Design a protein around this ligand. Structure first.
Ligand SMILES: COc1cc(N2CCCC2=O)ccc1Nc1nc(NCC2CCCC2)c2c(C#N)c[nH]c2n1
Length: 265
């Protein structure tokens, strides 16, 4: 198969995991048979803005991983005026593909996944990033944890063999005319919801103007089927409050019993 050298090292291409824009992701193996992901970006045609988004991704990636191992790790990279090669921690699969296979989630793994997401999003917040477009696809499963991959600056990748609106916070939709960490809480809540109720809140409204409306509609109430874990019920409820000022914050979520008391009640 094709190969790829990166800063004086050779990797063999198992398969292509993903693509988007002028970039590809490959599952590869190194010299010693270990497994990695490599993102390749063809800069040939690339505006000075798109160019600076890739540059920004790499910098923040390099800074943020010092502060959390819930952020997908970047080990090495080559960047020229022609190309970018990023050698990264390779995920098993992304959370949106895993969810789409409809296998229901062990409650204790859902709770642990939730910790993972909070830790990751919390540390990007602590460096001034509000993702703004969080969705299942931003998380990869490795070492039995969820790890964040795309900080929503450089354009998001898609898996190889559309994209949705279901996680869009209300403030974002009301804002289109003529930015808060709370916005990520809403999207994180929609992911949790999905992990607990099998569906995102407005995943039934198949029509998208219809869907968009519900999200911003103070009198379209979101259902919250009662469940064994009541702390989980309460987390989803405060995460999906439409007034971002009443919505719960990450630092609050980190003090919340769902996360803090290990027996799920
Ligand atoms: C066998 O590895 C995988 C396989 C699958 N999928 C999808 C369905 C079938 C399958 O096997 C998904 C993910 C992985 N791992 C993986 N993916 C990556 N980018 C994939 C895109 C991220 C958004 C959706 C796709 C990166 C990555 C970057 N940038 C840095 N490490 C990475 N690790």
């Amino acid at each position: 198969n094709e190969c790829i050298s990166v800063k004086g090292r050779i990797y063999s291409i198992l398969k292509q995991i993903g693509s988007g824009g002028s970039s590809k992701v490959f599952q590869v193996l190194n010299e010693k048979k270990q497994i990695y992901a490599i993102k390749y970006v063809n800069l040939e045609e690339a505006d000075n803005q798109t160019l600076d988004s890739y540059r920004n991704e790499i910098a923040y990636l390099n800074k943020l991983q010092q502060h959390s191992d819930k952020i997908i790790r970047l080990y090495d990279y080559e960047i020229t005026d022609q190309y970018i090669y990023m050698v990264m921690e390779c995920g098993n699969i992304d959370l949106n593909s895993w969810l789409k296979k409809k296998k229901s989630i062990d409650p204790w793994e859902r709770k642990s996944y939730w910790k993972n997401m909070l830790e990751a999003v919390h540390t990007i917040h602590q460096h001034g990033i509000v993702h703004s477009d969080l969705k299942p696809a931003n998380f990869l499963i490795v070492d039995g944890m969820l790890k964040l991959i795309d900080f929503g600056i450089a354009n998001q990748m898609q898996p190889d063999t559309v994209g949705t609106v279901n996680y869009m916070p209300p403030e974002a939709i009301k804002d289109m005319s003529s930015i808060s960490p709370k916005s990520d809480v809403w999207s994180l809540g929609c992911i949790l919801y999905y992990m607990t109720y099998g569906k995102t809140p407005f995943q039934q409204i198949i029509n998208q103007i219809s869907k968009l409306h519900a999200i911003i509609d103070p009198n379209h109430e979101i259902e919250f089927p009662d469940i064994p874990e009541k702390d989980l019920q309460d987390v989803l409820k405060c995460c999906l409050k439409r007034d971002p000022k009443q919505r719960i914050s990450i630092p609050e979520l980190l003090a919340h019993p769902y996360v803090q008391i290990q027996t799920l009640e």
